[PDB]
């Protein structure tokens, strides 16, 4: 396969370990490069976090309008949205929007205790047939991305399959599926990653992840024109190139994937 | 409200952080002073622990007559009932009664074991719509009550609303609801707190909490004569006065809330 | 009871603490020697781990054919099967077979991950009415078997009753019940323990456990000829004799139990 050889070369240039999974729901075709290896998910877990909250909203156990207040001691790093509402708090819906579109870390911590902690998120994932993904820690510790540590990891194939189930399955109500899609489409953190390499007329929703040990992740749902959605999970870790080059690797994966798919047609 | 100002002055005299929530089920009237701030709940969680046990009994995954045995090495501090039954053990019902009416710490640990741990209690609370309260540790570490630590915390408003759903809603069976009510009414540890400030003809059940960093708590269900229950959750932490004065702060909160309620009518 | 006196003297020969539980499903008779006390499970938990995985297969949330891959660095000690499939991985069914019949430790960790962790296994046991057994750690730490540590423990009576409900109750589908039975019957690690002392015409399935502090365990389901199943949970810890002599204690428990049952019938 030419795409696998292309990704192996791109992986070698990055100096780290690269994981790619593609799921085309029009064809059923799947592609994987290290698709069944574990990678630190980092903030890419926040897409699953909002899904578990929306499921509880569907169950009548949670309300998007419920207001959550907090103090300045509850703020952790990379919280550009929650740092502004120490005085008035934020609603659950506003916290999910901040956690997805701005990768707000404190918002994720507040939503995690709304669920009951990382084990509750893992249990929700087990409840929908994801027997692979696991969340173990809170922010910011879940971003350590140490080699050999299975904590807070997923595989590209499992993540892509889980999002297909979340966005297109019967797990969430039609209202919450659309809300999760709307949040991912409105992401502001991934202009340099998968979105950069995708054709401009593609409708894209995505959630990014960044961690230590040169970790750069991006997960997307892609709607080509008059085309069923394509799910894409890219994970890069242990890489030796700088932050901008790691983003370009993700963008390069997008270009390689699209160019592999123009051959299938 | 004059009550908010009165509690502000009482909070000032306490030197700490005071949290108050009132839930009046006869009218629907609610009141809160820092009702949405997190407080170390300490032993007040044992009311929710017993409810989670009773829910599993209603579930017939648990039996109130089931006997649990333990050794002296399993005893933690302040366990006045469980320390007397190292030889013969205690039933689940006896452990719940000991955990509520005497705030027995080892009894709480054994019941947490019967649940499957603090995360199992949190999961039960999430199953009944409490998205705020969390238990994270066992006895006695859950009582460290460090400022800024969200572990083992609740808010006054959440605890009052959860106590209401457990005692009035249909989370528990009628028999289980009456049993939890009976345990709370039979409490022996809270005579100097909310009970002290309430009118004598009030039917009251309560659960106390005490911890480090000058922490003194009390949650209660109060039935005035010919009156639907009123749920009351009071949390004091970081206070700078001794334990006797902290109990007096809780008793004064009951006096102020009652005085505010009678002024609401006459 | 003579069997109680006999187990008492045998316990003292072992130099440690001995726990025995018998559950005869033909008559309902149950026997216990320290059947209420907690013992470190060690690998005996893997029988419950496979049941929890089989329950999810019944629910359609897991597939026995699902392949799991792992790396060289993921292997822990005592992993005779998993160490040969770093390249090709293994299916869930293959991991359950290795975890049960060879007591493979890495296979158990991979299956614990498929569940969501030790707390997920404990939650499954609470869901079927086992309010006693708890798993807290992963391999190999769960085999520490420190005296007084309630982590990763069960009681003989709870394990026998749980094994009974898993193999004969409505928890699992008949297909997964038969699969769990077939795995236990195919165990390769218990020839020197309970199986050694049982009559040769008995059909036996078992799961062994071994840990530090001289811990030697074995749980079994025993089919005598034309007789309903008998469940037997034997736990030994803090033993002062070597590994072979600890194995011989378990075999002697089987001999003592069978002889006592011979007296029950005649
Ligand atoms: Na004892």
Residue numbers in the entry:
A (entry chain C): 27 to 58, 60 to 238, 240 to 252, 254 to 294
B (entry chain A), C (entry chain B): 27 to 58, 60 to 238, 240 to 252, 254 to 295
How is this structure described in the published paper?
The starting point of the engineering efforts reported here is a Kemp eliminase we previously obtained through minimalist design on a β-lactamase background. Our design took advantage of the conformational flexibility of an ancestral β-lactamase scaffold to produce both a suitable cavity and a catalytic base within it through a single mutation, while a second mutation enhanced relevant interactions at the de novo active site. Kemp elimination is a straightforward proton–abstraction reaction that can be performed by a simple molecular machinery consisting, at the bare minimum, of a catalytic base. FuncLib does not per se predict mutations that enhance catalysis, but rather suggests variants with multiple mutations that generate stabilizing interacting networks at the active site, thus focusing the search to safe regions of the sequence space.
Finally, we have used X-ray crystallography to determine the 3D-structures of the catalytically optimized GNCA4-2, GNCA4-12 and GNCA4-19 variants, the first of which has a transition state analogue bound at the de novo active site. These particular structures were chosen as they are all highly active variants, in terms of the measured rates within the available substrate concentration range, with improved catalytic parameters over GNCA4-WT. The protein backbones of these new structures are essentially superimposable with that of the background GNCA4-WT variant and, therefore, the observed enhancement of catalysis is likely linked to small rearrangements in the de novo active site. Here, our crystal structures illustrate that significant gains in activity can be achieved without the need for corresponding significant active site rearrangement. The short extrapolation leads to a catalytic efficiency and a turnover number of about 2 × 104 M–1 s–1 and 102 s–1. These values are well within the ranges of catalytic parameters for modern natural enzymes and, in particular, the value 102 s–1 for kcat is about one order of magnitude higher than the median value of the kcat distribution for modern enzymes. To assess this, we also performed EVB simulations on the variants for which crystal structures were available: GNCA-2, GNCA-12 and GNCA-19. For these variants, the calculated values fall to within 1.3 kcal mol–1 of the experimental values, and can deviate by up to 2.2 kcal mol–1 from the values calculated from the FuncLib predicted structures.
